[PDB]
Amino acid sequence: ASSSTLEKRIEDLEKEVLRERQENLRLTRLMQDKEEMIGKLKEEIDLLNRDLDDMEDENEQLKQENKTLLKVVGQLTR
Amino acid sequence: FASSSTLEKRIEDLEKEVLRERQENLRLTRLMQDKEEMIGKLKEEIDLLNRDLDDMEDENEQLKQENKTLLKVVGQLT
Ligand SMILES: [K+]
Ligand SMILES: [K+]
Ligand SMILES: [K+]
Ligand SMILES: [K+]
Ligand SMILES: [K+]
Ligand SMILES: [K+]
Numbered sequence: 001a002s003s004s005t006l007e008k009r010i011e012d013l014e015k016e017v018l019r020e021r022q023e024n025l026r027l028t029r030l031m032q033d034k035e036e037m038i039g040k041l042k043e044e045i046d047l048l049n050r051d052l053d054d055m056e057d058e059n060e061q062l063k064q065e066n067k068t069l070l071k072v073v074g075q076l077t078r
Numbered sequence: 079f080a081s082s083s084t085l086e087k088r089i090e091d092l093e094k095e096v097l098r099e100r101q102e103n104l105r106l107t108r109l110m111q112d113k114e115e116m117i118g119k120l121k122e123e124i125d126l127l128n129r130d131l132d133d134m135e136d137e138n139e140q141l142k143q144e145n146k147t148l149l150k151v152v153g154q155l156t
Binding site: 001003006009014017027031035042048066073 | 151
């Protein structure tokens with residue numbers, strides 16, 4: 001094993017380490033992005049479910065009003 | 079100047095390092111694929127909830143026009 005070949009092996013491997021560290025940094029940051037996205041989506045789901053609950057309530061209320069008005073008309077017909 | 083042995087160990091160490099960092103990036107890659115799947119399902123859920131909210135919107139409008147008609151009927155009778 002000649003010292004020149006060894007020194008070049010070291011040079012190459014060190015380049016490699018730097019490269020893969022860059023790639024890992026990239027992946028880590030991307031990971032944080034995906035995580036943020038998951039958070040926002042989950043929040044959006046919670047909001048949508050609150051909206052859905054609100055709609056269920058407004059509609060049930062309207063159905064009871066209709067039931068009442070229909071009942072009234074029923075009385076004005078008999 | 080560095081010993082052929084010294085160089086051999088720097089090489090040893092660097093190779094261990096590369097293998098380590100590669101394992102780590104593999105881990106991150108798989109974790110990433112997970113995050114993307116998760117995001118997919120969440121977005122799909124958002125689609126279903128928005129469809130449901132649309133359905134509730136239509137039903138809401140139908141109940142409101144029905145309500146208005148009934149009010150009108152009550153007005154014409156008494
Ligand atoms: K070598
Ligand atoms: K290499
Ligand atoms: K890390
Ligand atoms: K060295
Ligand atoms: K090292
Ligand atoms: K890669």
